[PDB]
Amino acid sequence: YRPLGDKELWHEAWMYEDKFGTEEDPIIVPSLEAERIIGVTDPEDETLVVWGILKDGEPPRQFVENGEFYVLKHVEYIKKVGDVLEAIEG
Amino acid sequence: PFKLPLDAYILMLPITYASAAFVAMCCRVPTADPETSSIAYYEDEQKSAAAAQRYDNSFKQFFDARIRNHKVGVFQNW
Amino acid sequence: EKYSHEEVVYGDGHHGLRKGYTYDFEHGPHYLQPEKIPNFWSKFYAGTGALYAVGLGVPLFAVWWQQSKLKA
Amino acid sequence: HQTAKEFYMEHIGKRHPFHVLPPSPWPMLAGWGTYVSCLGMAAWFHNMPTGGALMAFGMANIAWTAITWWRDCAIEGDMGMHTEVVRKNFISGMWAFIVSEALLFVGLLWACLHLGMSPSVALQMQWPPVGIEPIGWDKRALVMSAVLAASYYSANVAMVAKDPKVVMGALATTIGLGAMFLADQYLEYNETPFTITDSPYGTTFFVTTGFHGMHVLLGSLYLTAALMMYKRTHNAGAALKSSILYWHFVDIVWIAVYGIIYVGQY
Amino acid sequence: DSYKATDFTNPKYNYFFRELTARVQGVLLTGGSLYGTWLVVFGEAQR
Amino acid sequence: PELITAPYDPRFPNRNQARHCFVRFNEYYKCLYERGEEHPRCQFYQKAYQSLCPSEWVESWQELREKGLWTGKY
Amino acid sequence: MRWLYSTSHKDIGLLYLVFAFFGGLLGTSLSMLIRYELALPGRGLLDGNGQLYNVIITGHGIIMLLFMVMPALFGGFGNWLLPIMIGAPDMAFPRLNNISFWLNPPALALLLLSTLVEQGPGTGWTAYPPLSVQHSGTSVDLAILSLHLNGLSSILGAVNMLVTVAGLRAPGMKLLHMPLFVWAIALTAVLVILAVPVLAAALVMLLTDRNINTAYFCESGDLILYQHLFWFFGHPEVYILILPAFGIVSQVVSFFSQKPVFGLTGMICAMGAISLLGFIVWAHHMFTVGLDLDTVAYFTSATMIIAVPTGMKIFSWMATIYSGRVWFTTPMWFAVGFICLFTLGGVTGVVLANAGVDMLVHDTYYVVAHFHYVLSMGAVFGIFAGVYFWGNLITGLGYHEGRAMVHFWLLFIGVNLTFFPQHFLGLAGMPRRMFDYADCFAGWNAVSSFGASISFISVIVFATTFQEAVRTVPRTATTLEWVLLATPAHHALSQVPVLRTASS
Amino acid sequence: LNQVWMSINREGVFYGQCSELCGANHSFMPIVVEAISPRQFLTEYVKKWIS
Amino acid sequence: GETIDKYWAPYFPKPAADEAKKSVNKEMVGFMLLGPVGVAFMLYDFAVGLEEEHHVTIPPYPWMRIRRLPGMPWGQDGLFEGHPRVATTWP
Ligand code: HEA
Ligand code: HEA
Ligand SMILES: [Cu+2]
Ligand SMILES: [Mg+2]
């Protein structure tokens, strides 16, 4: 994970991961439903934002050019990281 | 919130000028001739004439030479 | 029941079509479904005509009212 | 109903810390109550019969709907619908409302400063006008200043205290010191040697002090409503902090009002 | 076990505060609005 | 022929000239009280306020003086 | 029940839009009487009743300023679009958002009811004393109470907007990633909170002068103090009504150019500089009231500085269209028409800002032409640009493209041939707020009255543009409202979307 | 009491109207200024107002 | 026992018992600086109230007792005005 200092404890991290999504090793995005809107910035320009829709049971998907790949996973609970695992502090 | 772009300081120079002009204008009004709550202010004619002529001259004496030269336009229309 | 604090706080747990709606606006995929109101285009044109008639006829009535007061 | 809480947990509560409301009828009733009270106020200005009664009827309807709305807000605050971020949203909203009221007071004191500094020929260029006796600063207004500063410090006591008895006593002390401000303002309004129709001095004095006194009354009622919720559960949340902020705002407004009108003779 | 009869936010008071007022005040504002409209329109000011 | 009007008073610099009217009207009656009735300076003040003040303003000021509602010392 | 008891921001925004359309219909109807009376010299359909003409222009100006543009931009598009755009699940105070709407039909009813009482409130939309005080009866009090209720509506809405922006943003989204529409609405809310209570104080002073025999603006008071307070409100008011139009133009131009906005931080600094300079130049409405020359000197020199940020915004819009892949539809034309015709209205403001030139054209139809350029080409074009752009997302109905271009061209022809001759009338010296003029002013008044009929016919054709919509499935977008279905669900953003920064 | 300093270059008849809204008959308060030479003004016109 | 406020409670920690009492004492010093003396003088003022009298009649200057409309919405005299002081005779 990234340093959790100066982060709100209820932000559901995975967005604070130390991993760049590749085709062979994507970032798994948890979801409470079969589809979920996320937002990816442009790696060469922070001011540019692209919103996309991930679907369950689909191949890895890239949103911006030279950006990460993402896979949705349907879960019952999403870890509200800031008190879920840094309280575990394993 | 962000990095102030090279434009924003060029904007901020006349904005600071306008704010300073506004503050100086609001400040000089309680040091003016008609802002006196008495009739006995005008019975000293030397001091009142001096104060009101000083209220005339400031910010107008910069323009006297070009008022006399009729520099009332950007171009020179006769 | 029916006046408890939970009814105040979480509303009434109604499910399905409300009274005369043909679509679930609260929990369905669309909060406005104008292709499911029966005879929608008659009602839309009647409502737009009424809105046009009132919005163009209120100042005319106020002109007629003020001038009927002088002419007396 | 039993599954409505279940539905709220499954779909709104467990996803984000923000509060989603069911449908409510009080804004529509409050708007039409303002309409009725405005018609009544217009009739009461020009001495129509049964106009003041209509204005009081509309204002009573507005006050009743506002109390019902605030009771619903307190009920929702007691079923634990408001997380910490919702309470910070409450504090930020009170800050914005306070800024609006402060600009209203700045507009009110603008007129006092303009009229007092340059007396016109209609007043024979004398301020204050002859016949008007100004209210001094070395008398009962100074007692009001001391009392309201004490109310400021007592409301500051209740903000940091953790003992419930000390909090309730400090709240009651600030409410009682606020009620002593108003009953003394009533005596100023009765003993004064000028009316609201006597010169722009009387006009500006009475309009500005009346708005300030109405804000003192509203802040005292807000602090009183905050105390009874603390009396029951020993927990107030955003009701205590917003009310203490509003009371501090009233105390800050009084400083400008006193310094402009009572000291500056404007 | 957390509510008294002296309590303003009692659940037994919710019908009176929320259901009865929603129709009583709803008809009172209609009656006040019609009378205020007639009073301002068809009334004569004495001041 | 030459026409004589009220001179420019340096004490009154603004575009609103009501105070010049009022002060000249008051200086006339101060001159009338102090230096007699037929002094040249009093006639100067009289022609000065007559040249500036509207007639309605002046007649309102003598009815306020006659009713006793003039705040001047004299 | 649904439309009476609502707490959803999307229902409240739609109610604001329908209300603003009703107010626009009322002000269109009141404006055909103005142009039908002024078509020919002499006495027209008003039978020489000047008080009724003053009532008509007062009600028309107040309605079009306060019950059309603000309920369409600030209340209609802002409430529908802001929580979806920043990712908030709802507003911060959902029931305050319903009373912010429901104080507007009472204010409209009071204003329309003041016309049927006595001889009506013929004072102008500015309502200057002692003309407003001299009016005997009830109509002026109903008008001022209507303004009070609308100001309370605006203050409540601004508080809700400012708390919704600051505290319900999506996770990971800072004050750099919000669209320029959000920044415009936030700055408009700040302006409303700082400006409306000064108007409320001035109106309370007006009621105490009228009905309590007080001494604010009277024999022993000062009447210039009213103009000071009212225009200290009123110059921020015209920037309140144009900033959401700037936001809508930015969103429309960036969409169909297939490009992001040029100079985002410059755009935000320009909107902030416009918001800040709008509070220190109010007295350019008071050049002819007899202020001292130093005050007039400052208010002349500080008014023209507003040209620089607006020019920066216009040039950045042109740079956004520059080097793009542009497709011209009906919202794209209303934005191009905005940028072309707002520039024409802005340059006459620079002329009016110069005080010596303003001594010749004050209270003439030159001023009328200026502010109908910056309001009928600036705000009305911005409103109609958003109606065709977001309409299938908001209402669930599409629009016929050919009839929308017919409506755009009828409107563009009508409003240009209406207010462009009024420049020549105002330069020649035709004064404002008059229903009869000199014989030589007949030609341009006939031309302008011909143009107003084309504008009215354009208003008629707009009701025929609506048709059934086609619905598809979204995948990606650059803003959050275009990955949603048309129409969205009642709880849009069923899961809260987050913004993830790319890793190393 | 707002003062204006004015000096006219040429003789003629100059027209005007009132330019502040003031009631039902705001349209019907026109202004006409007649300008003549100073010697005519001081030898003929001012003799109409000597009592 | 499954409320939203308790559900999100561990994610919003309180910012960190005798320091509270120290702060109460610090604020109560300023409270007692101006508290008892103002209450004592106000209770004195409540007993020296409507007993003094003024007989200074005011001449009816044009800026006194403005009556642009006849009377007031409640009556003839001002509100809270037991004894008008402006001359109604004038003489
Ligand atoms: C928003 C501001 C606005 C708009 C749009 C207009 C629109 C028009 N106005 Fe006016 N006008 C004013 C603001 C406006 N006006 C003000 C403030 C005054 C001053 C009054 C006073 O001095 O007291 C004034 C006064 C005024 C005068 C001067 C009168 C006088 O001095 O005596 C004239 C003269 O021709 C005029 C004519 C017109 C015409 C022909 C239109 C045409 O454009 C007709 C309108 C056509 C439209 C297309 C606009 C309607 C918009 C919609 C319908 C969009 C809403 C739709 C949705 C929300 C979906 N109006
Ligand atoms: C939409 C509302 C709106 C907007 C945006 C504006 C914008 C401006 N206005 Fe105006 N105005 C009104 C609405 C508006 N106004 C109304 C309703 C009235 C009459 C009130 C009444 O009823 O009495 C009025 C009246 C009014 C007056 C009072 C004059 C009088 O009535 O006697 C003045 C004086 O300074 C003024 C000036 C300006 C200026 C300088 C701008 C500037 O913000 C415009 C700046 C824009 C540009 C200048 C063009 C873009 C810039 C460039 C392309 C760069 C190049 C430019 C240069 C190099 C100079 N307008
Ligand atoms: Cu302006
Ligand atoms: Mg004017």
From TrEMBL, chain A:
<dbReference type="GO" id="GO:0005739">
    <property type="term" value="C:mitochondrion"/>
</dbReference>
<dbReference type="GO" id="GO:0005740">
    <property type="term" value="C:mitochondrial envelope"/>
</dbReference>
<protein>
    <submittedName>
        <fullName>Uncharacterized protein</fullName>
    </submittedName>
</protein>
<dbReference type="GO" id="GO:0006123">
    <property type="term" value="P:mitochondrial electron transport, cytochrome c to oxygen"/>
</dbReference>
<dbReference type="GO" id="GO:0045277">
    <property type="term" value="C:respiratory chain complex IV"/>
</dbReference>
TrEMBL record, chain C:
<keyword id="KW-0812">Transmembrane</keyword>
<keyword id="KW-1133">Transmembrane helix</keyword>
<feature type="transmembrane region" description="Helical">
    <location>
        <begin position="44"/>
        <end position="65"/>
    </location>
</feature>
<protein>
    <submittedName>
        <fullName>Uncharacterized protein</fullName>
    </submittedName>
</protein>
<keyword id="KW-0472">Membrane</keyword>
TrEMBL record, chain D:
<keyword id="KW-0560">Oxidoreductase</keyword>
<keyword id="KW-0472">Membrane</keyword>
<keyword id="KW-1278">Translocase</keyword>
<comment type="similarity">
    <text>Belongs to the cytochrome c oxidase subunit 3 family.</text>
</comment>
<dbReference type="GO" id="GO:0005739">
    <property type="term" value="C:mitochondrion"/>
</dbReference>
<feature type="domain" description="Heme-copper oxidase subunit III family profile">
    <location>
        <begin position="14"/>
        <end position="266"/>
    </location>
</feature>
<feature type="transmembrane region" description="Helical">
    <location>
        <begin position="90"/>
        <end position="117"/>
    </location>
</feature>
<dbReference type="GO" id="GO:0006123">
    <property type="term" value="P:mitochondrial electron transport, cytochrome c to oxygen"/>
</dbReference>
<keyword id="KW-1133">Transmembrane helix</keyword>
<feature type="transmembrane region" description="Helical">
    <location>
        <begin position="203"/>
        <end position="223"/>
    </location>
</feature>
<comment type="function">
    <text>Component of the cytochrome c oxidase, the last enzyme in the mitochondrial electron transport chain which drives oxidative phosphorylation. The respiratory chain contains 3 multisubunit complexes succinate dehydrogenase (complex II, CII), ubiquinol-cytochrome c oxidoreductase (cytochrome b-c1 complex, complex III, CIII) and cytochrome c oxidase (complex IV, CIV), that cooperate to transfer electrons derived from NADH and succinate to molecular oxygen, creating an electrochemical gradient over the inner membrane that drives transmembrane transport and the ATP synthase.</text>
</comment>
<feature type="transmembrane region" description="Helical">
    <location>
        <begin position="137"/>
        <end position="154"/>
    </location>
</feature>
From TrEMBL, chain H:
<feature type="binding site">
    <location>
        <position position="18"/>
    </location>
    <ligand>
        <name>binuclear copper center (CuA)</name>
    </ligand>
</feature>
<protein>
    <recommendedName>
        <fullName>cytochrome-c oxidase</fullName>
    </recommendedName>
</protein>
<comment type="similarity">
    <text>Belongs to the cytochrome c oxidase subunit 2 family.</text>
</comment>
<feature type="binding site">
    <location>
        <position position="20"/>
    </location>
    <ligand>
        <name>Mg(2+)</name>
    </ligand>
</feature>
<feature type="binding site">
    <location>
        <position position="22"/>
    </location>
    <ligand>
        <name>binuclear copper center (CuA)</name>
    </ligand>
</feature>
